[PDB]
């Protein structure tokens, strides 16, 4: 039951002429905000996206981000020119925080260049990753001597974000704790080994994410059950499949059992054919 706030930024520079900067905000697994290069403001995707913040508070934040995007693009382009860095440039920012039961909180600010970690904001100052291009330190000593940037980032991460997240959790409590019942169906695919079959148990439309899926014969669990990756549905639910390798003819008697918090204490048991 953890709901950290992830604020993501994708900034692409193709050439001196062409640049995009877009952003997202996730609370847990749900996207609460969207930020487009075309838009002058950050769009709220949920009724509770603003949390308990007033309009004045949200306008203050809106101003900062608007100024931030302009300067960031200007700073990077000039900094690249000074170092003779070759376009294209791909920059990513991951920042936010997490609220803990004891009124305590932890935050993070991470920047990546061309897919690799370069620097991050720890405490009151910026610090490089152990493997980073030597020129990263040039950017850092500049960023550290910037009082406005240094203090505003702290104010956002430590001062604002924890209060913001607390507001989101209270205002959006009904939707965050929602229960969505899974739906299962069975399928079979020819195995790599001749004279065999692979059974596929599909589970889709469920939330929250934790789920239990196992192939079973009677009350005995099949150990050969192979769980797959969680694949997102676009309706904000999860999709998952489980596979079992069995010899042809051994299919009968097998069932797929599914345990989930939304099922009211009763497992979904799906028999073959």
């Amino acid at each position, epitope marked *: 039951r953890l709901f950290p706030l992830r604020c993501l930024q994708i900034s692409s520079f193709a050439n001196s002429s062409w640049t995009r900067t877009d952003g997202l905000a996730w609370l847990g697994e749900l996207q609460t905000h969207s930020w487009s290069n075309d838009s002058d403001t950050v769009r709220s995707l949920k009724p509770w996206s603003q949390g308990t913040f007033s309009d004045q508070q949200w306008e203050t934040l809106q101003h900062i981000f608007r100024v931030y995007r302009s300067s960031f693009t200007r700073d990077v382009k000039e900094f690249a020119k000074m170092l003779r860095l070759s376009y294209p440039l791909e920059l990513q920012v991951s920042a936010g925080c997490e609220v803990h039961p004891g009124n305590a909180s932890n935050n993070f600010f991470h920047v990546a260049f061309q897919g690799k970690d370069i620097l991050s904001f720890q405490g009151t100052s910026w610090e490089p990753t152990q493997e980073a291009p030597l020129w990263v330190n040039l950017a850092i000593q500049v960023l550290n001597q910037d009082k*406005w940037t240094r*203090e505003t980032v702290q104010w956002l991460l430590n001062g604002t974000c924890p209060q913001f997240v607390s507001g989101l959790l209270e205002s959006g409590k009904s939707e965050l704790k929602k229960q969505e019942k899974p739906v299962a169906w069975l399928s079979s695919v020819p195995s790599s080994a001749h004279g065999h079959r692979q059974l596929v148990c599909h589970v889709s439309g469920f939330y929250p994410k934790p789920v239990w899926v196992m192939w079973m014969r009677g009350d005995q669990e099949q150990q050969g059950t192979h769980r797959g990756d969680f694949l997102p549905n676009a309706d904000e639910t999860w999709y998952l499949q489980a596979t079992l390798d069995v010899e042809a003819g051994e299919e009968a008697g097998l069932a797929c059992r599914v345990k989930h918090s939304s099922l009211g204490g009763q497992d979904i048991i799906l028999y073959w054919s």
Partner: single-chain antibody
Framework: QKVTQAQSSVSMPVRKAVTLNCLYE???????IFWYKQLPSKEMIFLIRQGSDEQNAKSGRYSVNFKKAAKSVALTISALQLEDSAKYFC?????????????????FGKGTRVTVEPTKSVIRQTGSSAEITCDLA??????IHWYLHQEGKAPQRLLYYDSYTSSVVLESGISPGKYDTYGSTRKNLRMILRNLIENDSGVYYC???????????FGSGTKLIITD
């Protein structure tokens, strides 16, 4: 009031310590606090700077006790000398959403006279005009600021000259036509006062932000006496 110095006057013996109180009001999360010293010559001298995110500032005999919660920043002079007799001003630099531009005004308290117990003067007649000349070597030719100090009141910025737009930017409430500038970023720059009244009497400073360290440098004040 944005900056409050409650003590109007303080007298202290030589070789002892004095503490000057200053209270400020700001809604910003990042700011500077400055302490200035006005000599009897009306020369405005920078003493010490207190950052909002920094620890208590200590320079020479000057020390700052910074309480961020109470928004209380108090200067303390350690061993008072005879040359320490002056009017001390508490000042607050605020930022904008763009950070701390060199267009930033400095907000003054009304000041506190400290008495330790053991420049050009111009006179004009009502209806005439006057030219205040600015002598400043360094640091920043980018924006030249003009401040006015009248006794009983806190020093106010009248305007500043933008050398990037080559224009004058007047503070809110000041009627155009009263003040204007003529010259380049070089010391030839002067401020013209038109249609002088008796309330125009005071000390006029030219000021710029320093390049190396961030502080407001004030030039030698010009004393303007106006008679009816």
């Amino acid at each position: 009031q944005k900056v409050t110095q409650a003590q109007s006057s303080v007298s202290m013996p030589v070789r002892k310590a004095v503490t000057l109180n200053c209270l400020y009001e700001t809604s910003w999360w990042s700011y500077y606090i400055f302490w200035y010293k006005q000599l009897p010559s009306k020369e405005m001298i920078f003493l010490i700077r207190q950052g909002s995110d920094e620890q208590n500032a200590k320079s020479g005999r000057y020390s700052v006790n910074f309480k961020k919660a109470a928004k209380s920043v108090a200067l303390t002079i350690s061993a008072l000398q005879l040359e320490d007799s002056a009017k001390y001003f508490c000042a607050l630099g605020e930022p904008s959403y763009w950070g701390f531009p060199r267009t930033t005004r400095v907000i003054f308290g009304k000041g506190t006279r400290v008495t330790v117990e053991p420049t050009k003067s111009v006179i004009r007649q009502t209806g005439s005009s006057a030219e205040i000349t600015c002598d400043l070597a360094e640091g920043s030719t980018g924006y030249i600021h003009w401040y006015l100090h009248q006794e009983g009141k806190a020093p106010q910025r009248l305007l500043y000259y933008d050398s990037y737009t080559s224009s004058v930017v007047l503070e809110s409430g000041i009627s155009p036509g009263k003040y204007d500038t003529y010259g380049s970023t070089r010391k030839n720059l002067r401020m013209i006062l038109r249609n002088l009244i008796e309330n125009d009497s005071g000390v006029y400073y030219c000021a710029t932000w320093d390049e190396k360290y961030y502080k407001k440098l004030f030039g030698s004040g010009t004393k303007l006496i106006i008679t009816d």
